[PDB]
Ligand SMILES: Cc1cn([C@H]2C[C@H](OP(=O)(O)O)[C@@H](COP(=O)(O)O)O2)c(=O)[nH]c1=O
C-alpha cells in the first residue's frame with residue numbers, strides 16, 4: 001500500500017470527512033472502523049477527536065487498500081494519516097471506534113487495528129468503560 005496526498009475540506013464526524021484528493025472534493029469513510037453516530041454515546045467525542053487530529057496536522061495523506069476504493073454511497077474507502085499517524089488506528093486505540101466492516105480484500109491493516117482495540121479494552125477506555 002502507499003500514501004497519497006490530500007487536504008482537509010471539512011470535518012463531518014468520527015469516521016467520515018470531506019477531503020480534497022487528486023484535486024476533487026470527496027467524502028472519505030475510514031476503513032475497518034466504526035465510530036458511534038454523533039447522536040450516540042461517545043459520538044461527539046469521536047467527532048471531536050477526528051476533527052482535531054486533522055486540524056492539528058501539517059500533512060494529511062490517504063492510503064487505499066487492495067480492493068474497492070469507493071463504497072456504494074460514493075465514499076472513498078481509505079486509511080487516513082495525520083503527520084504519519086493513522087487516524088483509523090488512533091480512534092481504535094482510544095476506545096472511540098470499534099474494529100468493524102472487515103471485508104475480504106480491503107483488510108490489510110486488520111490485525112494492527114485489532115491489537116489497538118485489545119489495548120483500549122484492557123485500559124477500559126471510552127466505549128469499553
Ligand atoms: C466502512 C465501510 C462501510 N460500507 C458500507 C456498509 C454499510 O452499509 P449500510 O449503510 O447498508 O449499513 C455502511 C456503514 O457505514 P456507516 O458506518 O458510515 O453508516 O457503509 C462499505 O460498504 N464498505 C466499507 O468498507
Ligand SMILES: [Ca+2]
Pocket residue numbers: 015034035036037
Ligand atoms: Ca459510524
